[PDB]
Each structure stands twice: as structure tokens, then as C-alpha cells.
Design a protein around this ligand. Structure first.
Ligand code: C
Length: 377
């Protein structure tokens, strides 16, 4: 049989890891590959070097039936090597299971590689604090069994169902935070259940690539020379991190733009509650989905250097280009940021807060929210 590798991710963290996997394997120019990465366009110069390389759109967190046409090109026995986003794993593998169903003799699942979406997994697990995890796991395994057998999705506990793929396939999980699993006492039954099927995301993998593969990887994530250089200057550096909002509105986006500009000034103005001192060069790392929110900071702020919003913050870590201090709105990027580089984390009782306090990312101090900082200026 042939092995076909599928890389599916609507978000960004998993994509970063999958792109690394691609890079690590990039010597093989003919291994069938199917990219379903909503946030990363593989440039055409790289595309033209590979054969049997395919692309599928995602819609509603699942590949479209365009996937069937790709797969039909491989008439032999095929084994599926699948990389997914943990939070949306159930939906992302739905059409693959559907296709498998129409082709039992030829199509089988080799294994699954699951990666965290971000803070979302943790916030959702935090909400199961009061439940009997052990009982929840068994229900999940049983319901997953029904899905695999009927194609129908029905989970009493959709959060816990994300973690029971062991019962069906060889799987490896890559967690943003292993600590959460090891330290949260109510999750001890999930931890033991997972046994040897998980590991921490290895942010040092980049260091082990050859220099040409590094240049290659940088092209996939879009970390160009111009950005690299401004982060190599020899001066004290602070990066303000932006956030965004789902709420496809305007009054909310606008409000978020205003508050985030205010939060910036609390960091950068002498009268601010968060004032960092006047010995740092200021940088802005807007949120990749910030849109107008990011424009708003660049249009109204003063002596600040922009790090193109599309570049995922974790790329700076991999390339060793982390600044001295990082501050801004609570974000998935703070789960992997070295502790001594945290200036201050602000939020917009609260499970996101509970998660970060449990992980020690924030202390017992007293959470600062958006709306408690006065309008400076
Ligand atoms: N200011 C920001 C915010 C998020 N991000 C990217 O978006 C991902 C998810 O972030 P949020 O949890 O903040 O939505 C982060 O892991 C990071 O890769 C960024 O690069 N810069």
C-alpha cells in the first residue's frame, strides 16, 4: 500500500507543527501529501518542486468533498497518515471516515497526530473540573465507537471525546501544556489513560534542521529578512501583543481597538499603570486575525516597530529572536513563552484566568482586565 499524509488545520499552532513535519520530510519529493491548512499558503516556488502534492479547502472545520477527488487518484491500497487539530479533530476527520466507509477494502487509517489549537483546549478542559473523568472517558470511547461504525457524531462530552482516539487508532498527541495534564488533579484519570501517547510540542525542532531546511521553513511561515533584521538589533526590546475578537460586529471590534490602544499606552507612557520604563524599543505583534484592530494601533501609536501580524509569534522563539519583555492581552502564545520574558498579561471566576494561574503563567496577584484601566491621554 501507499501512505498518504494529510495535514489538516484551520488554525495556526497545529499548522506550524505540521509544516515542521513537512520540512523534516522535505527530502522525499514524491510522497503523496494533502494540505488543508487554512492559514498557510505554500508558495508556488516550493509547490513546483514536489509531485503528488495536493490542496483541499476547509469549511466548517472539515475538508470539502474535493478531498474525495484527490483520493480517487490513488487506486491502490492506501494508508492514511493524518495530522489534525485536537479541538476540531472529530469534524476534521469526518469526511475521511466517510470516504473510508465507501472503500473498506482499499482505504485504512495508519495513524493520527494531534496538535493543540491553543488556549481553547485548556479552557474547555477546565470546565470539566467537577465531573467524573473516568466515567467520561468510557462514555467518550463508547460514543467514538458508534461514530466509527455509523458515521454519526453524538458525544455527551465533546471535550473529553477529543482525547480518546487511542481506542481506535495509533495516535500521538502534542500538547501546548503537559503541565496542565500533570498538575490538574481532576485530570489525573485522563493523564494515566493517555499513558505514552502524548508529548509536549518541541519548539526546539527548528534548531535541529539543517540551515537550508531552516530557510525553507521560514518561507512556509512567512518570516522574511526584513523582520528578522529588526529583531537582531542590539538593544532592549519589548513586544506588545495584540488580540482579536470573533464577534463579527463593529461596535465590539471598535471597542477592542480602542481598549487595546489604551492598554499599549499603559505600558509605554510614564503615567501608565504598566509602565515599562524608557529603555526599551517598542514592537507591535498584532493578532493574525486582528484586521482593523491592528491598523488601529499602527495608525494611532507613536514610535513603534511593526512585526507583520501574519507571522505567528512562536516563530520568534524557534529562531531565537525573542525580545526581553513581552506584554499584552491573554493569548495562546503566553503558554510557551519563557517565564522571565513576561511583562504583564491583561484579560478582556474566569476559566482562562483559572488555567493561567494553575499553570503558574500568572500568579495569585490580582488579574487586570481591559475595562479597569483608565483612558489615558
Ligand atoms: N498577538 C498575537 C496573538 C496571537 N498570535 C498567534 O495566534 C495564536 C493563537 O492566539 P490567540 O490564542 O491569542 O488567539 C498564537 O499561538 C500565535 O501563534 C500572534 O502571533 N500574535
Amino acid at each position: 500500500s501507499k501512505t498518504i499524509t494529510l495535514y489538516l488545520d484551520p488554525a495556526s499552532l497545529p499548522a506550524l507543527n505540521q509544516l515542521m513535519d513537512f520540512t523534516q520530510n522535505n527530502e522525499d519529493k514524491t510522497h503523496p501529501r494533502i494540505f488543508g491548512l487554512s492559514r498557510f499558503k505554500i508558495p508556488d516556488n516550493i509547490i513546483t518542486q514536489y509531485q503528488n502534492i495536493h490542496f483541499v479547502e476547509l469549511k466548517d472545520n472539515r475538508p470539502t468533498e474535493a478531498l474525495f477527488t484527490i483520493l480517487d487518484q490513488y487506486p491502490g491500497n492506501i494508508e492514511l497518515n493524518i495530522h489534525l487539530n485536537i479541538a476540531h479533530s472529530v469534524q476534521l476527520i469526518r469526511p475521511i471516515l466517510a470516504y473510508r466507509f465507501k472503500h473498506l477494502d482499499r482505504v485504512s487509517i495508519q495513524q493520527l497526530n494531534l496538535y493543540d489549537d491553543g488556549s481553547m483546549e485548556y479552557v474547555d478542559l477546565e470546565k470539566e473540573e467537577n465531573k467524573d473523568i473516568s466515567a467520561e472517558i468510557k462514555q467518550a470511547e463508547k460514543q467514538l465507537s458508534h461514530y466509527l461504525l455509523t458515521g454519526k457524531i453524538k458525544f455527551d462530552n465533546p471535550t473529553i471525546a477529543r482525547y480518546v482516539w487511542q481506542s481506535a487508532f495509533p495516535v500521538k498527541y502534542h500538547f501546548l501544556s503537559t503541565d496542565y495534564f500533570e498538575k490538574a488533579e481532576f485530570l489525573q484519570p485522563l493523564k494515566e489513560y493517555l499513558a505514552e501517547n502524548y508529548q509536549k510540542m518541541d519548539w526546539t525542532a527548528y534548531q535541529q534542521l539543517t540551515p537550508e531546511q531552516q530557510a525553507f521553513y521560514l518561507t512556509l511561515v512567512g518570516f522574511n529578512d526584513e523582520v528578522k533584521q529588526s529583531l537582531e538589533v542590539q538593544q532592549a526590546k519589548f513586544i506588545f501583543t495584540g488580540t482579536t475578537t470573533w464577534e463579527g460586529n463593529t461596535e465590539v471590534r471598535e471597542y477592542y481597538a480602542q481598549q487595546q490602544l489604551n492598554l499599549l499606552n499603559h505600558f509605554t507612557q510614564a503615567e501608565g499603570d504598566l509602565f515599562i520604563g524608557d529603555h526599551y524599543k517598542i514592537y507591535f505583534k498584532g493578532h493574525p486575525r486582528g484586521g482593523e484592530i491592528n491598523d488601529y494601533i499602527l495608525n494611532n501609536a507613536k514610535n513603534i516597530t511593526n512585526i507583520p501580524a501574519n507571522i505567528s509569534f512562536e516563530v520568534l522563539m524557534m529562531t531565537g529572536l525573542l525580545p526581553d519583555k513581552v506584554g499584552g492581552v491573554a493569548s495562546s502564545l503566553y503558554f510557551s513563552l519563557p517565564k522571565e520574558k513576561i511583562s504583564h498579561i491583561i484579560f478582556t471566576n474566569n476559566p482562562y484566568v483559572k488555567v493561567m494561574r494553575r499553570l503558574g503563567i500568572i500568579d495569585e496577584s490580582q488579574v487586570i482586565f481591559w475595562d479597569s484601566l483608565k483612558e489615558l491621554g
